Symmetry: C5
Subunit: 264 residues, 5 copies
Amino acid sequence: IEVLGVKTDSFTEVECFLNPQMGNPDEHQKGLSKSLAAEKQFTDDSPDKEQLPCYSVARIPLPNINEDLTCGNILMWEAVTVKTEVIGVTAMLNLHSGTQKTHENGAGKPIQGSNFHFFAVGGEPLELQGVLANYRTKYPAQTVTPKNATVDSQQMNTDHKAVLDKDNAYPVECWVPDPSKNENTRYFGTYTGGENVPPVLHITNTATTVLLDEQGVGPLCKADSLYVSAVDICGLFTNTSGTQQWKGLPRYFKITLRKRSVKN
Amino acid sequence: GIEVLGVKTGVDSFTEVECFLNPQMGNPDEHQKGLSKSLAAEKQFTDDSPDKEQLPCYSVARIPLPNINEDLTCGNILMWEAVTVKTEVIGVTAMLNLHSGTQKTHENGAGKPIQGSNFHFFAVGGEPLELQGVLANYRTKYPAQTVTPKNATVDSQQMNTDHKAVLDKDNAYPVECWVPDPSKNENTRYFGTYTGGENVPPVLHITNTATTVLLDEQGVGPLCKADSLYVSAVDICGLFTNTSGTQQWKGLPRYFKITLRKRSVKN
Amino acid sequence: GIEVLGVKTGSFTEVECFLNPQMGNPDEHQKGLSKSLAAEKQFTDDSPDKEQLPCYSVARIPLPNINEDLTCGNILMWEAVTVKTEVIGVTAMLNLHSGTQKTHENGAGKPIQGSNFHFFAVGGEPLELQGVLANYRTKYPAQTVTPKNATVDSQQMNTDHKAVLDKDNAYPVECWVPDPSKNENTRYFGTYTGGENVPPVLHITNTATTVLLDEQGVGPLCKADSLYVSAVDICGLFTNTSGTQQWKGLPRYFKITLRKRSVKN
Amino acid sequence: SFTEVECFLNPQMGNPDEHQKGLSKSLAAEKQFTDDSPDKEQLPCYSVARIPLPNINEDLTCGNILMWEAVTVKTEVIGVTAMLNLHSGTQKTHENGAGKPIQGSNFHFFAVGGEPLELQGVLANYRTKYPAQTVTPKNATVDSQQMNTDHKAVLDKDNAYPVECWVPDPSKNENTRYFGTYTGGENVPPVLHITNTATTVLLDEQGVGPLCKADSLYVSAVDICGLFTNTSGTQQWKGLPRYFKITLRKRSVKN
Amino acid sequence: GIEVLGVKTGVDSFTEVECFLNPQMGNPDEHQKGLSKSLAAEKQFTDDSPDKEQLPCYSVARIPLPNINEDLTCGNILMWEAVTVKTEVIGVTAMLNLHSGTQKTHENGAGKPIQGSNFHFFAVGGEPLELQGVLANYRTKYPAQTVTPKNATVDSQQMNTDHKAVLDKDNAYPVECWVPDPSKNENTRYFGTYTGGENVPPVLHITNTATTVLLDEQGVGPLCKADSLYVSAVDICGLFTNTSGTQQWKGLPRYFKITLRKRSVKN
Ligand SMILES: CC(=O)N[C@H]1[C@H](O[C@@H]2[C@H](O[C@]3(C(=O)O)C[C@H](O)[C@@H](NC(C)=O)[C@H]([C@H](O)[C@H](O)CO)O3)[C@@H](O)[C@H](O[C@H]3[C@H](O)[C@@H](O)[C@H](O)O[C@@H]3CO)O[C@@H]2CO)O[C@H](CO)[C@H](O)[C@@H]1O[C@@H]1O[C@H](CO)[C@H](O)[C@H](O)[C@H]1O
Ligand SMILES: CC(=O)N[C@H]1[C@H](O[C@@H]2[C@H](O[C@]3(C(=O)O)C[C@H](O)[C@@H](NC(C)=O)[C@H]([C@H](O)[C@H](O)CO)O3)[C@@H](O)[C@H](O[C@H]3[C@H](O)[C@@H](O)[C@H](O)O[C@@H]3CO)O[C@@H]2CO)O[C@H](CO)[C@H](O)[C@@H]1O[C@@H]1O[C@H](CO)[C@H](O)[C@H](O)[C@H]1O
Ligand SMILES: CC(=O)N[C@H]1[C@H](O[C@@H]2[C@H](O[C@]3(C(=O)O)C[C@H](O)[C@@H](NC(C)=O)[C@H]([C@H](O)[C@H](O)CO)O3)[C@@H](O)[C@H](O[C@H]3[C@H](O)[C@@H](O)[C@H](O)O[C@@H]3CO)O[C@@H]2CO)O[C@H](CO)[C@H](O)[C@@H]1O[C@@H]1O[C@H](CO)[C@H](O)[C@H](O)[C@H]1O
C-alpha cells in the first residue's frame, strides 16, 4: 500500500484483554494445559489438543472511515503505539493450591520451566511459518498444523505458510511468525527453555512500543480491522503427583491509531 | 478523564512529601513482623482455606497534601501534580544475617539465605490503585479479613472482568489475588517485577540518585484528587527457611519521596 | 584495496535467504540434529563422525550485474547496508513429548538446553576463518575441511590455519572461528554459551535491523556480484529418552538491503 | 579551583586473627532467636574513612565562603583475581576436582559525601544480642524487623557498624551519594568488573555535588564478595578493598 | 610528565598494528597448550606450594612501532597515540568439542563443557601495565619463574601498598597474585571481568564491529613511550574437566587491533 504524509478526530484508542489458550483440560483448569506426556516415540506421538498451547488472536473492529472504497484516495487506520501487559503475574504467588512440596515442611513448587512470551499488532492476521521438532507428530483434528509435513519440516520447509486467523487453533510448537512476510505487522517474542527456568515478568503502565517501521509507517488496518496476537506460556505447573501442565496468563493490549491517507 | 491546561510554575509552586511503608506479609505474631505465617503446600483445590497471615497483602498509604484552598465551584482550579518519585527498598542488608533461626546449607555451613519467588512493586497516583483480580485457584476459600474477587468463577483463573477493585485498604488485598489494572489507572503510575522459582536469588539495588519521572505521554503526572496522594507497594523478597524446613514470605519496607507541582485543571 | 566513490540515489535492492542448519543429520528423519554425541574418547584416538560435528552454514546469493565494461575507471558495486536476521522455529522446542526424557516420574520431557552458539555474517566475499582446536590430535573425518597439519599450537594460535567459508556443511564449528585479522569486507556477530544446563534464550522480531556500514560509512562490497550469508545456530542439546544427546540447530533468515556504490577501478 | 584525592579502603569482614584478614570468623547457623549472640568477628561492618581536604577559608563569620564540592568519583574493587586461588584451604568440589570458589550472598556498596553516611537500622532478628565494640540499633523492638524510625545513626566509625544492622537512610543523605547492590543465595556467582575508564558523576538534580563540611570528605564501602568455604565445610565472609578517586571543585555558599 | 601538544592530522598521520596473544595458563606439556596443570585443592595455608604450571599468568606483548623522530634533540617531538582498539577472544567454538578426553554428564550423555570461574581482561598502554598485589593466602609459597608480591605480610590479603609491579614479562605474573593498579595506569586503559563459581557458564561474544575508544577525559589516548605499545590479556574461560574428574584452567588467545595517530609532545 502506497502511503501519504501524516495529518493532524484523527486519533482513536482501542483496548483488548486476550485469554491464553493453553488447552483447558476441563472447566476448572482454564489457563492450563492437559498433563504433559514425555518419552513418546517419534513414530507414534499423538498429542491431545488440550496438551498443546495455541496462539491467541483477536480481530478488533475499528470505526468505518470510508464511504466508497473505489476512491483513488482513502483513509486507513494506522496503529502507531501499543501498551501491552501480562495479566495475573501475582497469581503465581499461590504456592498452596494443589502444589508439590519442594521439601518436607516446605512451600509448594512455583511455576517454572520453559516459557514463551509473545505479542503482535498488525492490520492483518499474523503470517506464520511452520517448523516442527518432530515431523512425524500426529496432530489432533481440532488444530491447524503444517500440511504434508516432510523430513525438511524440522528445518526449512517453505510450503508451511499460514496466517493466524483462528484463536485456540494454531499450536505454538508448530508455528513461528514468518519474517519473510509480516510487512503489515509488528511482532515481538522471547523463548526461554529449561525445566528450572525462573519466570521473570515485568508490569507497568508506563511502557509504550512504537509501531512505526523504518519509513515511519505503522500497521495499516485492512477492512478497518486490527489484529492482536499473543502467547504467554509462563512455565510449567507441577501437581502434587509430579505431573505438569503449561501455565498461561492473559495479555492486555492498548493500541493508539491515527487516520492515514493512502493511495487506492 | 481530567482536562488539564499548560504548565506554569513560579515561586512556591512545588512541594515534597516522604513516606515509609511497612510490608504486609502476614505477621503471624508480634515477633514475626515482615514475615508471613509458615506456608502450606499440597492443599486440595476444592478445600484450600489459607490463613490471612499466610497471605501477603498490598501495602497502601494515603498521603495528605497541603491544602491549596481551591473552591470546587469554579471551572478552573489548581491540583497537585506528582512529577517525580525516588523510591527505595529498606533493610536489604538485614538478609546478611544467616545465623538467626536459619537452616544450615550443609554440615558446618552457614544458614540458608532468603531466596525464591519474589515480587517487587510500587505505585504513585492521585487515586487508589485500580486492581484486576486473577486467581491461580478460583475455588480457594479466602479468609474473612481479606478483600478477594467476589463470586469467583471458572474464568477467574484467566480473564474475569467482574473482578475490579481499588487498593483503598492496607493489609487487606492479597497479592496473589490482584494485579494493577492496565485498562484503568490513568491517574496512577505503577511498576512491578515478578520472579518465580524456589531458588531465585534476590537482587536488590539501593541508591539515592535514581529518580522516576511520573509524567505520562502528554507530560502530565498523577493529578491528586481531594489533595491526597496514594503510594502502593509490595516487596516480597523471597522465602525465609526455618531450621525445621518451614518457609515464610519475607518483606521489607519501601520508602517514597515524591515531588509535586501545582497544575491548572478544568473543573 | 578498494577505493569507494559516490552512492546512487533514488539504486536499491532487497534479497532474502533462509539458511538451513548443518548439525550433522544422522539420517533423513533427523534433520536439524547431529548424530549421537560421544564423550570420554582418548586424545590420541578421537575420530568423530561427520554427522557428530555441526558445521558452518553458508549461502552465496547472486546479485544483478551492474557494469557493461570492467576496464572503466569507475564501476558500480552492490553495497550491503542493513540486515534483518531471525532464528526460525524457536517455538518447536516447546515440544516436550517427542522422544524426550522425563525430568522425573509423571513429569514432562527435558527441554533442549546446554552449550549453544548463535552466529551470523554478511559479507561481499566468503567469511575468512582462523582454525583453533580443543584437541589438536583429533582425527577429523573425510568430507570436512579442518585445519591442515595441526600442531601443538593449534590449541592456541597457529596462524597457518587460514581458511574461507566457501562450502556449506563442510567446516566444523568446533574447528573454525571468524578471523578478526581479516574480514575487512564482512560483518560478523556471534555468541557462545557453555554449560550443559544453560537455558536457551531466543528473541524474535521483525523490527530489529543491523546496520552493516563500517567506521567510514561503507558496507560490505559484493565482489563478482555475490553476497555471502553465513550462520551457526546451535540451540543446545536434545536429550533422548536413553540419555543420549545430539546438537539441535535451527534455520536462520536473512533480509539484506543493498545499494549501488561507485568504486575506483 | 580543582583537586584530586585518592583512597584505598580495607574491608571489615571481622578478621578473627592476623592470618585471616579479609575474612570473617567462622559463621554460625541454626541459632535460637531468643539466644543469638554473634561475635564481632562474625559480623562484617561498614568501611569508612574521613579524607582531610586543603583548608580554603580564613574567616567563618563571613556570609560567603568556599566549600570543596565532590564532582566525580572513580571507584574500584581491589584484588578480584585473588579468588582464582582455588588451592589454599579450599573445599574440593568433587573427587580429584579443584577447590570451590568463593560464592554466595554478596553486597557491594560505596558512598561519597561531605558528611558521614546517614543510616537506618533494620534487623532480621530484633532479639539478636549484639556484641561489644559494635554500634547497633538501640532499644530494638518488634518493629525493628520492619520500619523503626528511632534507629537513626551515622557512619562515623570504621569496623563498628555491622552491615546486617544498617542501611543508608534514603530519607536523609542530602549531602551524600550512595550506591549498593545486594545479591542473596548460597550459590550466587560473584560478578566483578574492573576498569580505569568508568566515572560516576556526583552532582545532584540541581547540579550540586556533596559539599565537604569542615573540609572533610567521607568515603564509605562494603564489598562482601561471597562466602569462602573451608575444607571442613565451615564458611566465612570474604571482602576486598575498595579504591576511591574523587575530583573536587571550589564552590561558593551562603554562611 | 608529558606535556601533550597538537595532533598530527591527514596524510601519513595514522598507523594500524595487530597482535595475536597466546594465553598463559601453565602448559603442563607440549600437548596441553592453552591449559594449566591439574589443580590442587584443600592445601593447608601453611603448606601451600603451587607449581607454576598450575598458575595462569598475565599475557603481555610489547609491540614495536615505526620510528617517528629523525632527531631526538628537539624542544618538542611526536609520539604514537593509541586511539581505538578492536579486540577478540580467539577460538570460542573450540569448546563445542565435548568428545575429546571429556567427562560424561550422565549415562549415554555428552561430555561436560568447560565452565566455572572465569576472568576476561585486556589492556592497551604506552607502558607496561601497572599492577597491585593482592593474595587470597599470604603464606602461599610461590614457585620459581614467577614474579609475585615480595615480602608478603598479613595485610597482603587486603591492602599492602608495597606490592607494586609492572607487567613487563609474559608468563611470569600469576593472575591470582596481581590486579591492575587503579592508583596509577595513567597511560594505560584496562578492562576486566571476574566471574566466580564452579558452575558458571562462559558467555563469549565475537564480532568485528565492536570498537573501544582509548581517549581519556581530556581526549588523549595512551602515549607510546620508546615507540612501544603494550597489549596485556587474561582469558581464563573456565575449567576443563577430565574423565577422571581432575580439572585444569582453560584459556584462549586474544586478538588486538589498535589504531594510532601521531601526537606532538614537549621534549
Ligand atoms: C516445624 C513446625 O512444626 N512448625 C509449625 C509451627 O510450630 C511452631 C514452631 O516451629 C517454628 C518452625 O516452623 O520452624 C519454629 C521457628 O523458630 C519459627 N520461626 C519464626 C521466624 O518465628 C516458626 C514460625 O513461628 C511459624 O512457622 C510461623 O507460622 O515456627 C515449633 O518450634 C513449635 O514446636 C514445639 C515447641 O518446640 C515446643 O517448645 C512446644 O512444647 O511444643 C511445640 C509444638 O506446638 O511450635 C510452634 C507453634 O507455636 O506452627 C505453625 C502454625 O503456627 C505450623 O503448624 C508449622 O508447621 C508447618 O505448617 C505449615 C502451614 O502453616 C506447613 O503445613 C508445614 O508443612 C508445617 O511444617
Ligand atoms: C497422577 C496421575 O495419574 N495423573 C493423571 C490424571 O489423573 C487425574 C488426577 O491427577 C491429577 C494429577 O495429575 O495430579 C490431580 C491434580 O489435582 C490435577 N490438577 C489440576 C490443576 O486439576 C491434575 C490435572 O487435572 C490433570 O493432570 C490434567 O491432565 O490431575 C488423579 O488424582 C485422578 O485420580 C482419580 C482416579 O483416576 C480414579 O480412578 C478415582 O476414582 O478417583 C481419583 C481421584 O482422586 O484422576 C484424574 C483423571 O481422571 O489424568 C490425566 C488424564 O486426564 C493423566 O492420565 C495423568 O497422568 C499423566 O499423564 C501425562 C500425559 O497426559 C503423562 O503421561 C504422565 O506421565 C502421567 O502421570
Ligand atoms: C587422574 C590423575 O591421577 N591425574 C594425575 C595426572 O596423571 C596423568 C594422567 O591423568 C590425566 C587426568 O588427570 O585425567 C589424564 C588426562 O588425559 C590428562 N589430560 C590432558 C588434557 O592431557 C591429564 C593431564 O595431563 C594432567 O592431569 C595435567 O596435570 O592427566 C594419568 O592418566 C596417568 O596415570 C597413569 C597412566 O594412565 C599410565 O599409562 C601410566 O603407566 O601410569 C600413570 C601414573 O603415573 O598419569 C599422568 C601423569 O603422568 O598427573 C598429574 C601430575 O602430572 C596429577 O598427579 C594428577 O592428579 C591430580 O593432581 C592434582 C594436582 O595437580 C590434584 O591433586 C588432583 O586431586 C589429582 O587427581
